[PDB]
PDB file of all heavy atoms in Angstrom:
ATOM      1  N   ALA A   1     106.202 120.849  96.872  1.00  0.00           N
ATOM      2  CA  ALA A   1     105.436 122.011  96.430  1.00  0.00           C
ATOM      3  C   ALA A   1     104.428 121.603  95.360  1.00  0.00           C
ATOM      4  O   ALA A   1     104.613 120.601  94.669  1.00  0.00           O
ATOM      5  CB  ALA A   1     106.361 123.092  95.895  1.00  0.00           C
ATOM      6  N   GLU A   2     103.362 122.385  95.219  1.00  0.00           N
ATOM      7  CA  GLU A   2     102.335 122.089  94.226  1.00  0.00           C
ATOM      8  C   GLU A   2     102.821 122.390  92.814  1.00  0.00           C
ATOM      9  O   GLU A   2     103.389 123.453  92.560  1.00  0.00           O
ATOM     10  CB  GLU A   2     101.074 122.908  94.513  1.00  0.00           C
ATOM     11  CG  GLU A   2     100.418 122.624  95.859  1.00  0.00           C
ATOM     12  CD  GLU A   2      99.726 121.290  95.922  1.00  0.00           C
ATOM     13  OE1 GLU A   2      99.553 120.676  94.894  1.00  0.00           O
ATOM     14  OE2 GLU A   2      99.365 120.885  97.004  1.00  0.00           O
ATOM     15  N   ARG A   3     102.550 121.478  91.885  1.00  0.00           N
ATOM     16  CA  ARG A   3     102.919 121.682  90.489  1.00  0.00           C
ATOM     17  C   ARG A   3     102.086 122.784  89.860  1.00  0.00           C
ATOM     18  O   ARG A   3     102.488 123.400  88.876  1.00  0.00           O
ATOM     19  CB  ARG A   3     102.756 120.407  89.685  1.00  0.00           C
ATOM     20  CG  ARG A   3     103.231 120.505  88.248  1.00  0.00           C
ATOM     21  CD  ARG A   3     103.098 119.219  87.539  1.00  0.00           C
ATOM     22  NE  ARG A   3     103.500 119.323  86.147  1.00  0.00           N
ATOM     23  CZ  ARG A   3     102.722 119.807  85.163  1.00  0.00           C
ATOM     24  NH1 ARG A   3     101.507 120.232  85.429  1.00  0.00           N
ATOM     25  NH2 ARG A   3     103.183 119.850  83.929  1.00  0.00           N
ATOM     26  N   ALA A   4     100.920 123.031  90.437  1.00  0.00           N
ATOM     27  CA  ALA A   4     100.004 124.040  89.932  1.00  0.00           C
ATOM     28  C   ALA A   4     100.628 125.429  89.996  1.00  0.00           C
ATOM     29  O   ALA A   4     100.203 126.339  89.286  1.00  0.00           O
ATOM     30  CB  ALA A   4      98.709 124.016  90.727  1.00  0.00           C
ATOM     31  N   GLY A   5     101.615 125.601  90.871  1.00  0.00           N
ATOM     32  CA  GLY A   5     102.242 126.904  91.048  1.00  0.00           C
ATOM     33  C   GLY A   5     103.403 127.122  90.082  1.00  0.00           C
ATOM     34  O   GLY A   5     104.014 128.190  90.075  1.00  0.00           O
ATOM     35  N   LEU A   6     103.715 126.112  89.275  1.00  0.00           N
ATOM     36  CA  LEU A   6     104.830 126.206  88.339  1.00  0.00           C
ATOM     37  C   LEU A   6     104.454 127.037  87.123  1.00  0.00           C
ATOM     38  O   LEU A   6     103.408 126.821  86.512  1.00  0.00           O
ATOM     39  CB  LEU A   6     105.250 124.802  87.880  1.00  0.00           C
ATOM     40  CG  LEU A   6     106.414 124.727  86.869  1.00  0.00           C
ATOM     41  CD1 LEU A   6     107.714 125.150  87.544  1.00  0.00           C
ATOM     42  CD2 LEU A   6     106.513 123.307  86.340  1.00  0.00           C
ATOM     43  N   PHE A   7     105.322 127.970  86.748  1.00  0.00           N
ATOM     44  CA  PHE A   7     105.072 128.770  85.559  1.00  0.00           C
ATOM     45  C   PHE A   7     106.332 129.012  84.742  1.00  0.00           C
ATOM     46  O   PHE A   7     107.444 129.035  85.273  1.00  0.00           O
ATOM     47  CB  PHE A   7     104.460 130.117  85.940  1.00  0.00           C
ATOM     48  CG  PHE A   7     105.392 131.006  86.704  1.00  0.00           C
ATOM     49  CD1 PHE A   7     106.208 131.909  86.041  1.00  0.00           C
ATOM     50  CD2 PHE A   7     105.453 130.946  88.083  1.00  0.00           C
ATOM     51  CE1 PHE A   7     107.066 132.730  86.742  1.00  0.00           C
ATOM     52  CE2 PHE A   7     106.309 131.766  88.786  1.00  0.00           C
ATOM     53  CZ  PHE A   7     107.116 132.659  88.114  1.00  0.00           C
ATOM     54  N   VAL A   8     106.132 129.236  83.450  1.00  0.00           N
ATOM     55  CA  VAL A   8     107.194 129.638  82.537  1.00  0.00           C
ATOM     56  C   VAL A   8     106.746 130.883  81.782  1.00  0.00           C
ATOM     57  O   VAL A   8     105.602 130.955  81.334  1.00  0.00           O
ATOM     58  CB  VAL A   8     107.523 128.503  81.550  1.00  0.00           C
ATOM     59  CG1 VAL A   8     108.619 128.944  80.595  1.00  0.00           C
ATOM     60  CG2 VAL A   8     107.955 127.266  82.323  1.00  0.00           C
ATOM     61  N   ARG A   9     107.622 131.876  81.684  1.00  0.00           N
ATOM     62  CA  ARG A   9     107.253 133.130  81.033  1.00  0.00           C
ATOM     63  C   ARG A   9     108.383 133.732  80.202  1.00  0.00           C
ATOM     64  O   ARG A   9     109.554 133.647  80.572  1.00  0.00           O
ATOM     65  CB  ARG A   9     106.809 134.136  82.083  1.00  0.00           C
ATOM     66  CG  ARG A   9     106.286 135.451  81.552  1.00  0.00           C
ATOM     67  CD  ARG A   9     105.750 136.289  82.642  1.00  0.00           C
ATOM     68  NE  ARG A   9     106.810 136.797  83.497  1.00  0.00           N
ATOM     69  CZ  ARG A   9     106.679 137.070  84.809  1.00  0.00           C
ATOM     70  NH1 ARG A   9     105.527 136.875  85.415  1.00  0.00           N
ATOM     71  NH2 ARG A   9     107.711 137.537  85.491  1.00  0.00           N
ATOM     72  N   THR A  10     108.017 134.405  79.113  1.00  0.00           N
ATOM     73  CA  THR A  10     108.969 135.201  78.344  1.00  0.00           C
ATOM     74  C   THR A  10     108.484 136.639  78.270  1.00  0.00           C
ATOM     75  O   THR A  10     108.589 137.390  79.238  1.00  0.00           O
ATOM     76  CB  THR A  10     109.157 134.655  76.915  1.00  0.00           C
ATOM     77  OG1 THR A  10     107.884 134.606  76.247  1.00  0.00           O
ATOM     78  CG2 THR A  10     109.762 133.270  76.959  1.00  0.00           C
ATOM     79  N   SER A  11     107.905 137.002  77.132  1.00  0.00           N
ATOM     80  CA  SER A  11     107.268 138.302  76.972  1.00  0.00           C
ATOM     81  C   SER A  11     105.831 138.215  77.456  1.00  0.00           C
ATOM     82  O   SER A  11     105.162 139.223  77.677  1.00  0.00           O
ATOM     83  CB  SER A  11     107.312 138.718  75.519  1.00  0.00           C
ATOM     84  OG  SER A  11     106.592 137.815  74.727  1.00  0.00           O
ATOM     85  N   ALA A  12     105.375 136.982  77.611  1.00  0.00           N
ATOM     86  CA  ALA A  12     104.030 136.654  78.048  1.00  0.00           C
ATOM     87  C   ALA A  12     104.052 135.224  78.586  1.00  0.00           C
ATOM     88  O   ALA A  12     104.987 134.481  78.288  1.00  0.00           O
ATOM     89  CB  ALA A  12     103.050 136.815  76.893  1.00  0.00           C
ATOM     90  N   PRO A  13     103.069 134.816  79.393  1.00  0.00           N
ATOM     91  CA  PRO A  13     102.952 133.494  79.977  1.00  0.00           C
ATOM     92  C   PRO A  13     103.016 132.409  78.905  1.00  0.00           C
ATOM     93  O   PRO A  13     102.377 132.526  77.859  1.00  0.00           O
ATOM     94  CB  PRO A  13     101.572 133.554  80.640  1.00  0.00           C
ATOM     95  CG  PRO A  13     101.374 135.022  80.953  1.00  0.00           C
ATOM     96  CD  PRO A  13     102.006 135.750  79.788  1.00  0.00           C
ATOM     97  N   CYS A  14     103.790 131.355  79.180  1.00  0.00           N
ATOM     98  CA  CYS A  14     103.992 130.241  78.261  1.00  0.00           C
ATOM     99  C   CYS A  14     103.056 129.086  78.587  1.00  0.00           C
ATOM    100  O   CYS A  14     102.640 128.916  79.737  1.00  0.00           O
ATOM    101  CB  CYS A  14     105.439 129.738  78.322  1.00  0.00           C
ATOM    102  SG  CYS A  14     106.687 130.985  77.925  1.00  0.00           S
ATOM    103  N   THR A  15     102.755 128.270  77.591  1.00  0.00           N
ATOM    104  CA  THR A  15     101.966 127.070  77.825  1.00  0.00           C
ATOM    105  C   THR A  15     102.876 125.871  78.030  1.00  0.00           C
ATOM    106  O   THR A  15     103.716 125.565  77.183  1.00  0.00           O
ATOM    107  CB  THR A  15     101.002 126.804  76.654  1.00  0.00           C
ATOM    108  OG1 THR A  15     100.079 127.894  76.543  1.00  0.00           O
ATOM    109  CG2 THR A  15     100.232 125.508  76.876  1.00  0.00           C
ATOM    110  N   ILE A  16     102.706 125.185  79.153  1.00  0.00           N
ATOM    111  CA  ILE A  16     103.505 124.002  79.447  1.00  0.00           C
ATOM    112  C   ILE A  16     102.853 122.773  78.835  1.00  0.00           C
ATOM    113  O   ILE A  16     101.661 122.534  79.030  1.00  0.00           O
ATOM    114  CB  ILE A  16     103.686 123.820  80.965  1.00  0.00           C
ATOM    115  CG1 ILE A  16     104.458 125.024  81.537  1.00  0.00           C
ATOM    116  CG2 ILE A  16     104.423 122.517  81.255  1.00  0.00           C
ATOM    117  CD1 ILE A  16     104.484 125.081  83.053  1.00  0.00           C
ATOM    118  N   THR A  17     103.626 122.013  78.065  1.00  0.00           N
ATOM    119  CA  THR A  17     103.088 120.859  77.358  1.00  0.00           C
ATOM    120  C   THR A  17     103.350 119.574  78.125  1.00  0.00           C
ATOM    121  O   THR A  17     102.669 118.569  77.921  1.00  0.00           O
ATOM    122  CB  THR A  17     103.688 120.754  75.947  1.00  0.00           C
ATOM    123  OG1 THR A  17     105.095 120.514  76.044  1.00  0.00           O
ATOM    124  CG2 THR A  17     103.451 122.050  75.183  1.00  0.00           C
ATOM    125  N   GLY A  18     104.314 119.618  79.036  1.00  0.00           N
ATOM    126  CA  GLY A  18     104.600 118.475  79.894  1.00  0.00           C
ATOM    127  C   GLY A  18     105.899 118.663  80.660  1.00  0.00           C
ATOM    128  O   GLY A  18     106.728 119.501  80.304  1.00  0.00           O
ATOM    129  N   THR A  19     106.059 117.889  81.729  1.00  0.00           N
ATOM    130  CA  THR A  19     107.240 117.977  82.577  1.00  0.00           C
ATOM    131  C   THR A  19     107.691 116.613  83.071  1.00  0.00           C
ATOM    132  O   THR A  19     106.877 115.708  83.248  1.00  0.00           O
ATOM    133  CB  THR A  19     106.966 118.872  83.801  1.00  0.00           C
ATOM    134  OG1 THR A  19     105.882 118.316  84.558  1.00  0.00           O
ATOM    135  CG2 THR A  19     106.608 120.281  83.377  1.00  0.00           C
ATOM    136  N   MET A  20     108.981 116.499  83.368  1.00  0.00           N
ATOM    137  CA  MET A  20     109.522 115.332  84.053  1.00  0.00           C
ATOM    138  C   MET A  20     110.899 115.616  84.621  1.00  0.00           C
ATOM    139  O   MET A  20     111.818 115.980  83.886  1.00  0.00           O
ATOM    140  CB  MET A  20     109.595 114.131  83.119  1.00  0.00           C
ATOM    141  CG  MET A  20     110.318 112.932  83.725  1.00  0.00           C
ATOM    142  SD  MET A  20     110.183 111.455  82.722  1.00  0.00           S
ATOM    143  CE  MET A  20     110.891 110.225  83.812  1.00  0.00           C
ATOM    144  N   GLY A  21     111.065 115.403  85.919  1.00  0.00           N
ATOM    145  CA  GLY A  21     112.376 115.573  86.521  1.00  0.00           C
ATOM    146  C   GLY A  21     112.852 117.003  86.366  1.00  0.00           C
ATOM    147  O   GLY A  21     112.204 117.937  86.835  1.00  0.00           O
ATOM    148  N   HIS A  22     113.999 117.160  85.721  1.00  0.00           N
ATOM    149  CA  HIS A  22     114.626 118.462  85.544  1.00  0.00           C
ATOM    150  C   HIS A  22     114.292 119.105  84.206  1.00  0.00           C
ATOM    151  O   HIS A  22     114.851 120.145  83.859  1.00  0.00           O
ATOM    152  CB  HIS A  22     116.146 118.325  85.660  1.00  0.00           C
ATOM    153  CG  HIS A  22     116.623 117.995  87.033  1.00  0.00           C
ATOM    154  ND1 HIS A  22     117.126 118.946  87.886  1.00  0.00           N
ATOM    155  CD2 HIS A  22     116.670 116.826  87.703  1.00  0.00           C
ATOM    156  CE1 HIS A  22     117.470 118.375  89.023  1.00  0.00           C
ATOM    157  NE2 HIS A  22     117.206 117.086  88.938  1.00  0.00           N
ATOM    158  N   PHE A  23     113.406 118.489  83.432  1.00  0.00           N
ATOM    159  CA  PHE A  23     113.115 119.016  82.105  1.00  0.00           C
ATOM    160  C   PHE A  23     111.669 119.474  81.937  1.00  0.00           C
ATOM    161  O   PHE A  23     110.725 118.746  82.252  1.00  0.00           O
ATOM    162  CB  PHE A  23     113.463 117.970  81.052  1.00  0.00           C
ATOM    163  CG  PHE A  23     114.914 117.604  81.078  1.00  0.00           C
ATOM    164  CD1 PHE A  23     115.350 116.515  81.811  1.00  0.00           C
ATOM    165  CD2 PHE A  23     115.846 118.351  80.382  1.00  0.00           C
ATOM    166  CE1 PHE A  23     116.688 116.178  81.847  1.00  0.00           C
ATOM    167  CE2 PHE A  23     117.184 118.015  80.416  1.00  0.00           C
ATOM    168  CZ  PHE A  23     117.606 116.931  81.149  1.00  0.00           C
ATOM    169  N   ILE A  24     111.508 120.688  81.414  1.00  0.00           N
ATOM    170  CA  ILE A  24     110.196 121.270  81.149  1.00  0.00           C
ATOM    171  C   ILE A  24     109.998 121.575  79.667  1.00  0.00           C
ATOM    172  O   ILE A  24     110.824 122.247  79.049  1.00  0.00           O
ATOM    173  CB  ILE A  24     110.006 122.576  81.949  1.00  0.00           C
ATOM    174  CG1 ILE A  24     110.077 122.288  83.456  1.00  0.00           C
ATOM    175  CG2 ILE A  24     108.676 123.244  81.574  1.00  0.00           C
ATOM    176  CD1 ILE A  24     110.164 123.537  84.316  1.00  0.00           C
ATOM    177  N   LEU A  25     108.885 121.115  79.102  1.00  0.00           N
ATOM    178  CA  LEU A  25     108.536 121.465  77.729  1.00  0.00           C
ATOM    179  C   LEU A  25     107.442 122.518  77.715  1.00  0.00           C
ATOM    180  O   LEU A  25     106.398 122.348  78.350  1.00  0.00           O
ATOM    181  CB  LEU A  25     108.043 120.243  76.946  1.00  0.00           C
ATOM    182  CG  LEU A  25     109.030 119.099  76.723  1.00  0.00           C
ATOM    183  CD1 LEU A  25     108.328 118.018  75.910  1.00  0.00           C
ATOM    184  CD2 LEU A  25     110.268 119.613  75.993  1.00  0.00           C
ATOM    185  N   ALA A  26     107.673 123.604  76.987  1.00  0.00           N
ATOM    186  CA  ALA A  26     106.685 124.673  76.918  1.00  0.00           C
ATOM    187  C   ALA A  26     106.750 125.414  75.590  1.00  0.00           C
ATOM    188  O   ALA A  26     107.803 125.499  74.958  1.00  0.00           O
ATOM    189  CB  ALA A  26     106.892 125.652  78.066  1.00  0.00           C
ATOM    190  N   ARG A  27     105.615 125.976  75.191  1.00  0.00           N
ATOM    191  CA  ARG A  27     105.523 126.805  73.997  1.00  0.00           C
ATOM    192  C   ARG A  27     105.411 128.278  74.385  1.00  0.00           C
ATOM    193  O   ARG A  27     104.379 128.706  74.910  1.00  0.00           O
ATOM    194  CB  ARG A  27     104.313 126.405  73.167  1.00  0.00           C
ATOM    195  CG  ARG A  27     104.361 124.994  72.604  1.00  0.00           C
ATOM    196  CD  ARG A  27     103.045 124.579  72.042  1.00  0.00           C
ATOM    197  NE  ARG A  27     102.647 125.404  70.913  1.00  0.00           N
ATOM    198  CZ  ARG A  27     103.054 125.217  69.642  1.00  0.00           C
ATOM    199  NH1 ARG A  27     103.873 124.234  69.347  1.00  0.00           N
ATOM    200  NH2 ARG A  27     102.627 126.027  68.689  1.00  0.00           N
ATOM    201  N   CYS A  28     106.483 129.042  74.153  1.00  0.00           N
ATOM    202  CA  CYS A  28     106.545 130.446  74.560  1.00  0.00           C
ATOM    203  C   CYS A  28     106.353 131.410  73.384  1.00  0.00           C
ATOM    204  O   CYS A  28     106.841 131.162  72.280  1.00  0.00           O
ATOM    205  CB  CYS A  28     107.883 130.748  75.241  1.00  0.00           C
ATOM    206  SG  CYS A  28     108.082 129.959  76.852  1.00  0.00           S
ATOM    207  N   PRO A  29     105.661 132.528  73.627  1.00  0.00           N
ATOM    208  CA  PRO A  29     105.597 133.730  72.815  1.00  0.00           C
ATOM    209  C   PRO A  29     106.966 134.370  72.638  1.00  0.00           C
ATOM    210  O   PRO A  29     107.819 134.297  73.526  1.00  0.00           O
ATOM    211  CB  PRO A  29     104.663 134.634  73.630  1.00  0.00           C
ATOM    212  CG  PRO A  29     103.841 133.679  74.464  1.00  0.00           C
ATOM    213  CD  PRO A  29     104.774 132.550  74.791  1.00  0.00           C
ATOM    214  N   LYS A  30     107.157 135.006  71.488  1.00  0.00           N
ATOM    215  CA  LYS A  30     108.411 135.658  71.125  1.00  0.00           C
ATOM    216  C   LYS A  30     108.829 136.717  72.136  1.00  0.00           C
ATOM    217  O   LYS A  30     108.006 137.507  72.599  1.00  0.00           O
ATOM    218  CB  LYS A  30     108.277 136.280  69.735  1.00  0.00           C
ATOM    219  CG  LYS A  30     109.501 137.026  69.244  1.00  0.00           C
ATOM    220  CD  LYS A  30     109.372 137.370  67.773  1.00  0.00           C
ATOM    221  CE  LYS A  30     110.583 138.135  67.275  1.00  0.00           C
ATOM    222  NZ  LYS A  30     110.638 138.161  65.791  1.00  0.00           N
ATOM    223  N   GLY A  31     110.117 136.722  72.478  1.00  0.00           N
ATOM    224  CA  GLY A  31     110.650 137.668  73.455  1.00  0.00           C
ATOM    225  C   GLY A  31     112.165 137.550  73.586  1.00  0.00           C
ATOM    226  O   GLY A  31     112.788 136.705  72.942  1.00  0.00           O
ATOM    227  N   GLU A  32     112.754 138.418  74.409  1.00  0.00           N
ATOM    228  CA  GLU A  32     114.204 138.462  74.572  1.00  0.00           C
ATOM    229  C   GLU A  32     114.684 137.851  75.886  1.00  0.00           C
ATOM    230  O   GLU A  32     115.889 137.722  76.112  1.00  0.00           O
ATOM    231  CB  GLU A  32     114.693 139.905  74.470  1.00  0.00           C
ATOM    232  CG  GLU A  32     114.304 140.602  73.174  1.00  0.00           C
ATOM    233  CD  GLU A  32     114.861 139.934  71.949  1.00  0.00           C
ATOM    234  OE1 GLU A  32     115.924 139.364  72.031  1.00  0.00           O
ATOM    235  OE2 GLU A  32     114.220 139.996  70.927  1.00  0.00           O
ATOM    236  N   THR A  33     113.749 137.498  76.762  1.00  0.00           N
ATOM    237  CA  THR A  33     114.103 136.921  78.056  1.00  0.00           C
ATOM    238  C   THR A  33     113.262 135.692  78.358  1.00  0.00           C
ATOM    239  O   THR A  33     112.179 135.520  77.800  1.00  0.00           O
ATOM    240  CB  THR A  33     113.926 137.945  79.192  1.00  0.00           C
ATOM    241  OG1 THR A  33     112.543 138.312  79.292  1.00  0.00           O
ATOM    242  CG2 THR A  33     114.761 139.191  78.929  1.00  0.00           C
ATOM    243  N   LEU A  34     113.756 134.853  79.262  1.00  0.00           N
ATOM    244  CA  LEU A  34     113.029 133.669  79.706  1.00  0.00           C
ATOM    245  C   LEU A  34     113.161 133.482  81.210  1.00  0.00           C
ATOM    246  O   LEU A  34     114.266 133.519  81.752  1.00  0.00           O
ATOM    247  CB  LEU A  34     113.563 132.426  78.984  1.00  0.00           C
ATOM    248  CG  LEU A  34     112.979 131.073  79.426  1.00  0.00           C
ATOM    249  CD1 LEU A  34     111.515 130.982  79.030  1.00  0.00           C
ATOM    250  CD2 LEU A  34     113.776 129.965  78.780  1.00  0.00           C
ATOM    251  N   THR A  35     112.039 133.256  81.885  1.00  0.00           N
ATOM    252  CA  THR A  35     112.083 133.017  83.319  1.00  0.00           C
ATOM    253  C   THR A  35     111.205 131.848  83.736  1.00  0.00           C
ATOM    254  O   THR A  35     110.219 131.520  83.075  1.00  0.00           O
ATOM    255  CB  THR A  35     111.667 134.272  84.107  1.00  0.00           C
ATOM    256  OG1 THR A  35     111.904 134.049  85.500  1.00  0.00           O
ATOM    257  CG2 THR A  35     110.197 134.580  83.890  1.00  0.00           C
TER     258      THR A  35
END
């Protein structure tokens, strides 16, 4: 699958700083849920 379709979100869309394997680094806005 395309990596371009990968997203991380909480209360608002998160910025992904990098990825590898099973681990994703991202900077998320404050919120009570994560998807």
Side-chain angles (χ1 to χ4, degrees):
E2 298 288 348
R3 185 178 178 279
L6 179 69
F7 67 91
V8 179
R9 185 174 71 210
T10 57
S11 62
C14 301
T15 298
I16 297 170
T17 64
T19 60
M20 173 171 188
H22 291 260
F23 299 94
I24 298 169
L25 296 181
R27 296 169 63 83
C28 291
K30 178 169 179 165
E32 303 299 329
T33 63
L34 175 68
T35 188

